[PDB]
C-alpha cells in the first residue's frame, strides 16, 4: 500500500559455465549500472570477507559455493570501507545520496526506516544464496507458473489502486488552490 512502490531489485550472475571470472553484480534502482555485490555488502557495513560469506554460505563446508563466491571477493578487494563504497554510487552529497537510496529504495518491503542494514544485508545474502544454489544445480529454476506465486486482484484492490490515485490527485489540486490563495 502507501502509494505502492514497485522496485525490482535483481541479481545477475555473469558469464557462462567455465568462463573464468564469473562475478555477481547486483542491480539497484536509480543507479548508473550493476554493482559488484561485495561493494553493497560493505556499503551496508559488513566489511570483512569472512563475515560476508557467513552472510551468504550458511554452512561452512560448502566450499563448492565458496569457490563460486571467491571471484566476487577478489573483485571487491579494491574497496575496503563503507564510505568508499557509498562513494562508488551515483558532492559532498554522493555518500548521503547512496545512504538514503538504501534506506528507501533497497528492498522497500523490509522497511524504509533508519537502521535495518543488518536485515537487508542478511536478506540479500539469502537471495544470493538461492541464486547460487540454482546455478550450482541443486535446485531447479523457479517455476514461473506454480499457482502459489500468483495473486488475484478482485474488486477490492482494483478499486484500491484506482481510488488511491484519484485521491492523491485530489489532494494535489486542493493544495494548489491553497497556494493560489496567496492573494
Amino acid at each position: 500500500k502507501g502509494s505502492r512502490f514497485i522496485s525490482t531489485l535483481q541479481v545477475k550472475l555473469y558469464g557462462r559455465e567455465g568462463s573464468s571470472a564469473r562475478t555477481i553484480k547486483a542491480t539497484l534502482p536509480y543507479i548508473k549500472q550493476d554493482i559488484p555485490i561485495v561493494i553493497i555488502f560493505r556499503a551496508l557495513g559488513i566489511i570483512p570477507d569472512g563475515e560476508i560469506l557467513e552472510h551468504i554460505c550458511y554452512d561452512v563446508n560448502d566450499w563448492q559455493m565458496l569457490e563460486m563466491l571467491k571471484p566476487c571477493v577478489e573483485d571487491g578487494f579494491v574497496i575496503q570501507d563503507r564510505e568508499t563504497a557509498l562513494d562508488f554510487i551515483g558532492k559532498e552529497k554522493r555518500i548521503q545520496y547512496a545512504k538514503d537510496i538504501l534506506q528507501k529504495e533497497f528492498l522497500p518491503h523490509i522497511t524504509q526506516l533508519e537502521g535495518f542494514e543488518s536485515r537487508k544485508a542478511f536478506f540479500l545474502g539469502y537471495m544470493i544464496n538461492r541464486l547460487l544454489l540454482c546455478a550450482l544445480d541443486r535446485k531447479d529454476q523457479d517455476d514461473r507458473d506454480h499457482f502459489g506465486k500468483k495473486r488475484l486482484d478482485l474488486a477490492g484492490p482494483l478499486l484500491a489502486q484506482l481510488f488511491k490515485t484519484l485521491f492523491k490527485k485530489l489532494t494535489k489540486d486542493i493544495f494548489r488552490y491553497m497556494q493560489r490563495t496567496v492573494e
Binding site: 557495513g45 579494491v78 526506516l113 533508519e114 537502521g115 535495518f116 542494514e117
Partner: protein, 148 residues
C-alpha cells in the same frame, strides 16, 4: 441409482534465590543521561576500552509557509543525528552504527555493587566497528584501479 429428495423425511423421521526491589530511577538523572548500547565487532573478544588506549575521546563526526513533507519529529530528528561517534587517542578506533532493532523490549537491570537493580529502559543501541586499521582506501585512486 438416482438422486433422492425424500431424505428430508429420513432425518425428520430419524430425529540460592536472591530477591531485590527493582526501583525506578529518578527522572532527572535520566532526563539528561540517555542510555544506549555498546557493540564492537572485531572478535578480539574482550574489547576493553580501558585497555584500548588512552585518552579515549568520544564525539560525532520565497513566500510564507510552503509545502513540507511531513513526518514524526523523532525520525526527522533521527534523520538529523547522522554523525556517528568514535573512540580515538591524542592508534586504534571504533565507529558505531544505529541498530534500530530492539529498542522496544530491553530493560537494563542496574546490576550495581549493591544488589538493588534499577530497570533502565535502554534508549538506543549502537554497533561499533573498527576502521583505518590499515588506512588503506583509495576512494578516488581506487576507482582508477577498477577499470584496469
Amino acid at each position: 441409482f438416482i438422486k433422492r429428495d425424500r431424505m428430508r423425511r429420513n432425518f425428520l423421521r430419524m430425529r540460592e534465590y536472591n530477591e531485590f526491589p527493582l526501583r525506578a530511577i529518578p527522572k532527572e538523572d535520566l532526563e539528561n543521561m540517555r542510555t544506549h548500547l555498546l557493540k564492537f565487532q572485531s572478535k578480539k573478544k574482550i574489547n576493553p576500552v580501558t585497555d584500548f588506549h588512552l585518552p579515549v575521546r568520544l564525539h560525532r563526526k520565497r513566500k510564507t509557509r510552503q509545502l513540507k513533507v511531513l513526518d514524526e519529529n523523532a525520525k526527522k530528528l533521527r534523520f538529523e543525528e547522522f554523525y556517528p561517534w568514535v573512540m580515538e587517542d591524542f592508534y586504534n578506533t571504533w565507529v558505531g552504527s544505529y541498530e534500530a532493532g530492539n529498542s522496544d523490549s530491553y530493560v537494563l537491570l542496574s546490576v550495581e555493587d549493591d544488589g538493588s537493580f534499577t530497570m533502565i529502559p535502554a534508549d538506543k543501541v549502537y554497533k561499533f566497528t573498527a576502521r583505518n586499521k590499515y588506512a588503506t582506501l583509495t576512494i578516488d585512486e581506487a576507482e582508477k584501479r577498477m577499470d584496469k
